[PDB]
Design a protein around this ligand. Sequence first.
Ligand code: 7DZ
Length: 317
Amino acid sequence: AEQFAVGEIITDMAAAAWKVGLPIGCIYLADMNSSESVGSDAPCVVKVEPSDNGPLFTELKFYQRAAKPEQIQKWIRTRKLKYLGVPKYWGSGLHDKNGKSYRFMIMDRFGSDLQKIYEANAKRFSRKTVLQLSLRILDILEYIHEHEYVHGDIKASNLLLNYKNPDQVYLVDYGLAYRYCPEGVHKAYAADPKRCHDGTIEFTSIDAHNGVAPSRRGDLEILGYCMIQWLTGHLPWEDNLKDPKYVRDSKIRYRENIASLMDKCFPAANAPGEIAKYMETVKLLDYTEKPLYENLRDILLQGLKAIGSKDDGKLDL
Ligand SMILES: CC(C)CCN1c2nc(Nc3cc(F)c(O)c(F)c3)ncc2N(C)C(=O)[C@@H]1C
């Protein structure tokens, strides 16, 4: 046992009290302070890292600037959404242990990640599941982009289900999130010297492959590769992950001819029409261009109509 003494009470910077539970890297179950011990049904998690941990500071800044409970609620009301998949930030603080300094952050507790469900379903999601997931991810992306951040690492292991509601998906991990537009000033098309990360090789954007800072189009492109991987179980460059030059070369060539990507990914003739249209729309985006999120959602909604369905918010997992 390190970091915390189990069952101990911790006080955040806003003087809110929390009790620490068992682990579930260094993440523990947590709940509001009370006479009860923290159980397995806990609604919160406490993430703890040394004070000098860069990703936890970055993540904390994202949450403090963009994921305040009320800030998310105002967006849900104005956009008439059922929910928003941005995890709620409950508080943070500093904790000293054995002469060492740590930073902690209280967040929403979630259920399983999509990567596990994906693997348990023989590495496939139905067209209904993919479209319903992507509509919710487009809601998240629009929100974080409108709050000056890009994620840069969208993937099934970073998508968590609501602990009590299996039809609500959340995008997590903002440790390597990037503030692309501080104070409304878009970053230039160049490398960010502070930024060292390039995302997950199989899903990362061409921009990240070219060593430039991630932008909005990059998040949309990553989602495009996720959709293909989910529908088919594969990506064309999957057996060459060790070589980034190869992966970038393939993505670049496939971006030039999306019909060829469709033919490679969906060998038996027809590919779902909305995927090619989505990729073609993302392809038209300039580096600093604001995406037209509603047109991207409209492309996906036509996918739901084609399969005799509608956006009823059912993930079908
Ligand atoms: C982020 C990955 C590593 C998920 C890790 N993760 C869980 N995370 C959360 N909430 C959570 C974790 C975070 F890091 C966050 O930034 C956040 F906003 C929310 N709930 C439940 C679990 N469960 C069941 C697990 O099995 C593991 C430990």
